[PDB]
Amino acid sequence: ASVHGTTYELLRRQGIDTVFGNPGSNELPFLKDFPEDFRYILALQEACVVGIADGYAQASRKPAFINLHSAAGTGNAMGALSNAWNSHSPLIVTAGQQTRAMIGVEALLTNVDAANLPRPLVKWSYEPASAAEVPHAMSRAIHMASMAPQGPVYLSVPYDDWDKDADPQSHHLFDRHVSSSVRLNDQDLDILVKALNSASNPAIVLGPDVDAANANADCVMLAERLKAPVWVAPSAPRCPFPTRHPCFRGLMPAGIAAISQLLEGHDVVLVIGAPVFRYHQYDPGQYLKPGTRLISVTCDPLEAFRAPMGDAIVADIGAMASALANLVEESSRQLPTAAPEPAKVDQDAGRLHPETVFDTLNDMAPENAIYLNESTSTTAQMWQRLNMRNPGSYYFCAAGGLGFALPAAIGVQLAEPERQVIAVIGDGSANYSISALWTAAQYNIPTIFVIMNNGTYGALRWFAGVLEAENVPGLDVPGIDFRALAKGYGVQALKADNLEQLKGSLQEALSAKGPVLIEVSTVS
Amino acid sequence: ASVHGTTYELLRRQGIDTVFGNPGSNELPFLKDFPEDFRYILALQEACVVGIADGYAQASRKPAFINLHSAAGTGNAMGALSNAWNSHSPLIVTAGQQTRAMIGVEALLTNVDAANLPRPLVKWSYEPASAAEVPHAMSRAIHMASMAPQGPVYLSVPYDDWDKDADPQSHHLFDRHVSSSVRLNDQDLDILVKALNSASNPAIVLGPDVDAANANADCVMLAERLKAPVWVAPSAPRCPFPTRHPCFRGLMPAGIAAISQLLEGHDVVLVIGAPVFRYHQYDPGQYLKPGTRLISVTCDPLEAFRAPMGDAIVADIGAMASALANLVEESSRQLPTAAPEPAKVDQDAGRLHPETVFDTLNDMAPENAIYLNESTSTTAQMWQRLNMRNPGSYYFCAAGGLGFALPAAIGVQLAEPERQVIAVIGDGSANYSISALWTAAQYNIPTIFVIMNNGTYGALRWFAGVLEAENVPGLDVPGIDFRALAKGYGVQALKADNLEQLKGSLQEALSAKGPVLIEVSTVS
Amino acid sequence: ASVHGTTYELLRRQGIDTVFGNPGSNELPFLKDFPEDFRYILALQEACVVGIADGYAQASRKPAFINLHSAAGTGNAMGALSNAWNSHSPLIVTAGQQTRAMIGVEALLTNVDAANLPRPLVKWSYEPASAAEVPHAMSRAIHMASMAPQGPVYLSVPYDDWDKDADPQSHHLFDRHVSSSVRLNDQDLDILVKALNSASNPAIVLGPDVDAANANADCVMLAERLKAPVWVAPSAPRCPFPTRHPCFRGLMPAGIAAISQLLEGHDVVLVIGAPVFRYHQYDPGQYLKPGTRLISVTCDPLEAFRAPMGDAIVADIGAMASALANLVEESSRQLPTAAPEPAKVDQDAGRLHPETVFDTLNDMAPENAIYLNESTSTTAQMWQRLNMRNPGSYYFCAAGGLGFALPAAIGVQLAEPERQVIAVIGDGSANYSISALWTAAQYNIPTIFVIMNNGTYGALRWFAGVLEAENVPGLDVPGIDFRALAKGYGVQALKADNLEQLKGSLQEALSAKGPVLIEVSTVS
Ligand SMILES: Cc1ncc(C[n+]2csc(CCOP(=O)(O)OP(=O)(O)O)c2C)c(N)n1
Ligand SMILES: Cc1ncc(C[n+]2csc(CCOP(=O)(O)OP(=O)(O)O)c2C)c(N)n1
Ligand SMILES: Cc1ncc(C[n+]2csc(CCOP(=O)(O)OP(=O)(O)O)c2C)c(N)n1
Ligand SMILES: [Ca+2]
Ligand SMILES: [Ca+2]
Ligand SMILES: [Ca+2]
Ligand SMILES: [Ca+2]
Ligand SMILES: [Ca+2]
Ligand SMILES: [Ca+2]
Ligand SMILES: [Ca+2]
Ligand SMILES: [Ca+2]
Ligand code: NA
Ligand code: NA
Ligand code: NA
Ligand code: NA
Ligand code: NA
Ligand code: NA
């Protein structure tokens, strides 16, 4: 067998059947004789390729395979990798290298010092020392991406390797199973359960790895048993809990003082599947107030070591959530009372308040819709106004890197064909990965893109206001016609300049057979 | 509080009470006002500092703290770090940096791009962005070194940081507990147990992480229950099993073909606490023969991902060994029969055969002796001839890097004052870290050093013979007087030119009150 | 031809005829069939190997070739590389790697992520992607080490590469000549010359790259023409000027304020072949006083970019010094007056003052002696008391990393067989690379080693005194018998407890036919 044949057999045997890519010449010997049981998803720029693969991996809860062109293609994808690192997305990123005989002379398309290029945004990065090593290197990439804590990995392959003879002993790679589905030993787990049972006023904080593990239902049971309020950890990349469940308390403010104040009076705070904590604004104060102890369960040693407070347990989120949910006592305390419905913001017949847009989406979208958020000034209101009952219903760029939601929404929609995906994206954010629209058109992936157009980088204006920063350049983005951009890439386009038009456009988009972009005129 | 006071309180609260070091000016502001409850162990060169700390950590099964001087001190220790990486040794390596105000001008003693210096031999490497961050950076270092898979970490600290005010919120660091004491979920563990119970001819292979976890006794119970032969994985850095237990089958040859042949006919091979496998010689063939399936339990994702065959489970070795030992059925198969005693090699009244030396050590040493091996041509015979009944009884440079055993033997003896440490070191290997002898003298750490003197780099001569390699330079090391070197560093010195002298010298060394070096004339 | 044959032909054709090494198995296929026109210099530990090669390269003013064993050997040498980086030493460091087929499984002796290991202390680091690339990779290593600014480079080679067929087109590598012997364009050089001619009170500061370039005599002519005082830049690794020349003003204090004060009143300060500046102690103040402008000529962009003041010109030191010396006007100012002779320190019949030792060396040593300094508390007095008339007469660890002088003195003596090398080394420093003594004995390289024994790390005690730092551990090194250490490695050993014994021992050492160590009892 060739390295080509052996590598595709390994991928197939490890459950990979899709390649997300933008091709180049160093990759042609890999992509030739493309297997008939595989599918290739082309995107027009590499941030888009990786964003689509990332949404696909996060929603499917399985690794996604990517093929990029040498250093320039890898480089174009590095902002996307920053988000993937923070979301623990299991991405196998491969890139083609020059033929081994011309690497030393640094021929055009040579990826120089290739393994260092994507660092520090990958778990592992490598170029094999010989063609026969390629399948074993691919095996390494597959398992490292998939092991807790999941994350992106990188493999560079000289193009002449694919046609070489494989080692027959590579067959032992095909069916390897590697598990990290582990939980705290019984003795120490019993200690933890007793501490939860003994708490007088417990609180629970959940992060994105709960949704990644599909531990949501177990966390609901845990919260109900402990009669505990549940928050989502700050800067949330996913939604780990039904947002209208009586215990739900919403998104935590991303500030040190704000969080310790919120947790004051809670004697034990159990954090599951989140860093402690993904703060954002500088809000100095106490990490915790006296009387609060924190216990973190995380899949990631890099999370556990850096918490400024609390104990930590490094283990699989699915296994731990299941064990805790089934072991804790049923508290006789009263179940927390549901949050009140949000207020309706006054809305005239002109430009739309973001609150109106979210209320209307919530009214009209199916109960199993999936939302993506890259409307940076409106996140708090989005979290309050969308009833998300099901797992896998929310994605937000995990490192704050814009250019995620537009392509990721396409990958999520590809992963979940029966769930309507609705990406709510600011006019500023929409440009970073605008060409991703083409992939939705080309493959007829029926994502709905709602562009919130207020002509400005609103979150930055707001922060400049907080700083009392005057004379900051570059905050306005006037003069973008999003319907024309959608036309440019073959996507049906609608406008909404007021509420009646918004409802009409949403009705049309929801019944459309392909992707649809709605440009919404929102208040400045 | 100062950064100095807060950092020493953090260390004390996390169980650290010893600093292994070689001082320099960037470290004086750290070492000043040295706490009266701490002890400082000086060594004369940094490979020695780290080797001593490494032996101490491995034997104590707890992290060891190191303080080195800037780049040059760190650099002198990097061969020692290569071994520590392979042994999963929990080492907290700190180095002093220039004052922040002169880093940019690259004043003398500036550690340039400091975090990159020890890569790729550390789990984590870092220089803090401010003085107030130092305690939290130290917290990160402590927990990363200690989390499975354990390993060395590196922290560089500008010397002006120590006197600065600490953040009062650093107190939350002091009592953080971080656990990685995890095991496979019940469902999947039950599947594994059933596979072991159902095996018709199981075999067990144990690596160094069994001894690190003190899982030895649990592995004995497991082997007895399964009635399974037990090997030690190749290139063994520690001894994980009593070497005269009936199930014991000794050290595996470090070759691909040799291992698959040895395992032929075994239907299930359970590997615990080892890489699969630390091969050495090139011995191409089948990774496993038909009919053998392999299951690996490892604490290290970097081990699990790179195995060329078998399933893997990433979990704590102590927790997994205990669970398996207590869950498996008692097989009704016959217990394996003990290996026969080794042959006595004919020995005249002249220079000593290595086999004679090991037989004599085995006869004369206490039953709880601890051995170290850096006599590279004699390892196979050492493994056959020493009855090591207890855990923590054997250490060998885990990356093959010479200069480990001499200093490590001092650290092991410091960790285990009631167990006589006997380091068996070749005349070639003895030179790499020769100055470590001084630390044994200075602190009266009563290690016995047995120098096997045959005048040559014997393992290399042997391999050159295998290669049929002619005209290789640099293989002979004549003209070293080890008794004079021992005198140079204040260590009592004896000779043994024949068996009667060997017995006399060992009797004297065993009853001595301080360290002793015996130079043994061995056969070429 | 084989890769082996082609690579040795390339080395020979590029002027390399010596391999400094400590061998291992990954290197045997390189070292086998060792060419009869090459010589191998064995040392017992890798810091020693590199130190010897470094002294050899610095004194010979040509690249030196090193062969080390994988990661552990490379790691043991990294402190030595820190010095080599700072001295711009042209060192070609090669290390053997595992066979390509076992790199992925991380067999014992695999150098993982090898190119990253010696960073950031090398100009270039690399592992080739194929055997046929090895000669071209070696060509890269040779020329990068040798191009201005000279420095160490690293090449890792899988052991199976050597026996493979070379590319016949590799012959084009053999006679490549690469020049960096460049100087400032005529227009701008004329501007510089006019500025020097117009200065009313010029000063000159010289660094180690002057001595590396053998630009010393040109700098003498330049100083005589400009009638300018000449200092040596701080933390001096070499001596760039005759120390009894009337213009000579000695070693600059390594402090910001001290240097600006020293240069006050000098309108133009011309720095040649030094960083601006290798400060050491923190001595905050003005970088220059008003009225002083600084112009730096350096071979190193990394020096030019980081100067906090002054203009810079990046060019070859030899070419620039020659051009300036020959273009400037003869000033009619009076030639500076020679520094007065140093005072004689009162000396009784007991332990030796360092000043007495240097005065006696100066009296007794040949006028073409070469000195090395690793007696850290006595550097200022050494610089005042040794008349060094000739180039290549002084070496001091360029990064301050101890363990340099003892092995480097052997390499310098090998490079300069007709010049008596005298290494003055403190009792603390002597231990770092003590095993280097063996190489002097084995090859009969007649270096004289003068050990200044005061029982303490004196420079650190002094600095602790400056800090008012109390309770600093690890500053004393009692109990070392240096005559016994010398005996251990086969080197003739003498003592000197007083001045009469010092003179007797020096007389004996100077007329000896082999290396000699003198242990001198110096004042605390
Ligand atoms: C790749 C990248 N570039 C820049 C930023 C900085 N950034 C944060 S929010 C923001 C404004 C986004 O504007 P828009 O999408 O229109 O949303 P709005 O803030 O107006 O709600 C910018 C530019 C970023 N996070 N990522
Ligand atoms: C730091 C380092 N340098 C070089 C080697 C290569 N090496 C492996 S075995 C060996 C010989 C050791 O000789 P000795 O200690 O006398 O034992 P013998 O082989 O004679 O039994 C050498 C030099 C190594 N493993 N580590
Ligand atoms: C590799 C390394 N480790 C530690 C140091 C720190 N250091 C600087 S001077 C010094 C003392 C050297 O003592 P000695 O050689 O006896 O000379 P003295 O200061 O007594 O004159 C030390 C340990 C260093 N520079 N390099
Ligand atoms: Ca990078
Ligand atoms: Ca509503
Ligand atoms: Ca906007
Ligand atoms: Ca490095
Ligand atoms: Ca016996
Ligand atoms: Ca030997
Ligand atoms: Ca005199
Ligand atoms: Ca001293
Ligand atoms: Na358990
Ligand atoms: Na109103
Ligand atoms: Na379980
Ligand atoms: Na016999
Ligand atoms: Na010119
Ligand atoms: Na006097």
Contact C232, C250 (CB under 8 A): yes
Measuring CA to CA, which residue among A242, A311, A236 is closest to residue A270? A311
User: Cα torsion at C155, C160, C164, C170 (round to 10°)?
Assistant: 0
A116 touches chain C (CB under 8 A): yes
Atom of ligand 1 minimally distant from the CA of A425: 15
State whether the beta carbon of A423 lies less than 6 angstroms from ligand 1: no
Q: What are the structural domains of chain B?
A: 1-178 (3.40.50.970), 179-340 (3.40.50.1220), 341-524 (3.40.50.970)
Distances in whole angstroms, Cα of residue A216 to Cα of each of A152, A388, B125, B140, C485: 24, 12, 35, 30, 69
CB-based contact A181 B184, cutoff 8 Å: yes
Looking at ligand 3, which residue's alpha carbon is closest to its atom 8?
A: B24
Q: How many CB atoms lie within 10 A of CB A512?
A: 13
Q: A337-347 b/e with 16+ CB inside 10 Å = b? A: eebeeeeeeeb
Q: How many CB atoms lie within 10 A of CB C333?
A: 13
- The one-letter amino acid at B403: G
Distances in whole angstroms, Cα of residue A374 to Cα of each of A60, A308, A399, C508: 21, 29, 12, 83
B160 backbone dihedrals φ, ψ, rounded to 5°:
-75, -10
Peptide bond into C290 cis (omega under 30): no
CB-based contact A287 B169, cutoff 8 Å: yes
Peptide bond into A152 cis (omega under 30): no
Neighbours of ion ligand 4 (CB under 5 A): A 119
Q: Which of C78, C372, C429 to mutate to test the pocket of ligand 3 (most atoms within 8 A of CB)?
A: C429
The burial class, CB within 10 Å (0-12 / 13-18 / 19+), for C478 is exposed
DSSP B133: G
- The one-letter amino acid at A301: P
CA separation for the pair A449, A493 (Å, rounded)? 9
DSSP A128: -
CA separation for the pair A205, C205 (Å, rounded)? 64
Ligand 8 centroid to Cα of residue C206, in Å, is 69
CA separation for the pair A355, C166 (Å, rounded)? 71
Measuring CA to CA, which residue among B97, B87, B149 is closest to residue B123? B149
Taking the CA atoms of chain A, what radius of gyration do you get in angstroms?
24
Peptide bond into A248 cis (omega under 30): no
B115 touches chain C (CB under 8 A): no
Nearest chain C Cα to B22, which residue? C474
CA separation for the pair C151, A169 (Å, rounded)? 44
| Cβ neighbours for B465, distance < 8 A, ≥ 6 positions apart | none
DSSP string for residues in B26-51:
GGHHHHTT--TT-EEEE-SSHHHHHH
Q: How many CB atoms lie within 10 A of CB B265?
A: 12
C115 neighbourhood in chain A, CB within 8 Å: 113
| Cβ neighbours for B284, distance < 8 A, ≥ 6 positions apart | B256, B257, C101
CA separation for the pair B427, C438 (Å, rounded)? 13
A88 touches chain B (CB under 8 A): no
Distances in whole angstroms, Cα of residue B246 to Cα of each of B79, B261, C504: 38, 21, 68
Closest CB from B169, B176, B311 relative to A178: B311
Assign B359 to helix, strand or coil. Answer: helix
CA separation for the pair C316, C209 (Å, rounded)? 9
CA separation for the pair B119, B117 (Å, rounded)? 6
CA separation for the pair B190, B113 (Å, rounded)? 49
What is the 3-state composition of chain B as percent helix, strand, coil, each rounded to the nearest 5? 40, 20, 45
DSSP B522: B
Contact B411, B55 (CB under 8 A): yes
CA separation for the pair A364, A381 (Å, rounded)? 17
Contact A397, A237 (CB under 8 A): yes
Experimental technique, in short, is X-ray
Contact A438, A464 (CB under 8 A): no
State whether the beta carbon of A354 lies less than 6 angstroms from ligand 1: no
Task: State how far residue B366 is from chain C, nearest Cα, in angstroms.
Answer: 31
Closest CB from C104, C115, C136 relative to A104: C136
User: Cα torsion at C512, C515, C519, C520 (round to 10°)?
Assistant: 60
Helix spans in B416-479 (H): 437-442, 458-467
User: C447 among the known binding-site residues?
Assistant: no
A288 neighbourhood in chain B, CB within 8 Å: 172
C47 backbone dihedrals φ, ψ, rounded to 5°:
-60, -35
CB-based contact A304 B172, cutoff 8 Å: no
Q: How many CB atoms lie within 10 A of CB A290?
A: 7
Contact B57, B100 (CB under 8 A): no
Subunits with 3+ C-beta pairs closer than 8 A to C: A, B
Distances in whole angstroms, Cα of residue A356 to Cα of each of A383, A450, A522, B145: 13, 13, 10, 51
Strand partners, B93: B66, B154
| Cβ neighbours for B340, distance < 8 A, ≥ 6 positions apart | none
Interface test with B, best of A126, A146, A173, A185 (most B CBs within 10 A): A185
The two tokens of residue B492 are: 């009592």
Q: For the packed helices A3-13 and A134-146, what is the interaxial angle rounded to 10 degrees?
A: 20
Assign B94 to helix, strand or coil. Answer: strand
Strand order in the sheet with C293-298: C248-251, C230-232, C203-206, C268-272, C293-298, C311-314
CA separation for the pair A245, A266 (Å, rounded)? 20
Contact B305, B199 (CB under 8 A): no
CA separation for the pair A514, A491 (Å, rounded)? 8
Task: Give ligand 2 pocket residues (Cβ under 6 A).
Answer: B 79, 375-378, 400-403, 426-429, 432, 454, 456-460; C 22-24, 69, 72-73, 76
Helix spans in B96-242 (H): 100-103, 134-146, 186-198, 208-212, 216-226
Peptide bond into B277 cis (omega under 30): yes
Place of tokens 């150098």: C111
Contact C84, C49 (CB under 8 A): no
Q: Which of B457, B463, B482, B520 to mutate to test the pocket of ligand 2 (most atoms within 8 A of CB)?
A: B457
Query: Between A and B, how many CB-CB pairs are < 8 A?
Result: 132
Resolution (A): 1.5
Contact A49, A74 (CB under 8 A): no
Measuring CA to CA, which residue among A140, A130, A139 is closest to residue A165? A130
CA separation for the pair A138, A124 (Å, rounded)? 12
User: C454 among the known binding-site residues?
Assistant: yes
DSSP string for residues in A270-283:
EEESS-TT---S--
DSSP C159: G
Peptide bond into B449 cis (omega under 30): no
Nearest chain A Cα to B309, which residue? A172
| Cβ neighbours for A345, distance < 8 A, ≥ 6 positions apart | A353, A355, A356
Strand partners, A267: none
CA separation for the pair C522, B3 (Å, rounded)? 38
The two tokens of residue A101 are: 């005989």
CA separation for the pair A28, A162 (Å, rounded)? 10
Place of tokens 């560089």: B156
Strand partners, B271: B205, B296
Q: How many CB atoms lie within 10 A of CB A171?
A: 17
The dihedral region occupied by A126, where left means phi > 0, alpha psi between -120 and 50, and beta the remainder, is beta
Contact B352, B498 (CB under 8 A): yes
CA separation for the pair B82, C73 (Å, rounded)? 9
DSSP A94: E
Task: Give ligand 3 pocket residues (Cβ under 6 A).
Answer: B 22-24, 69, 72-73, 76; C 79, 375-378, 400-403, 426-429, 432, 454, 456-460
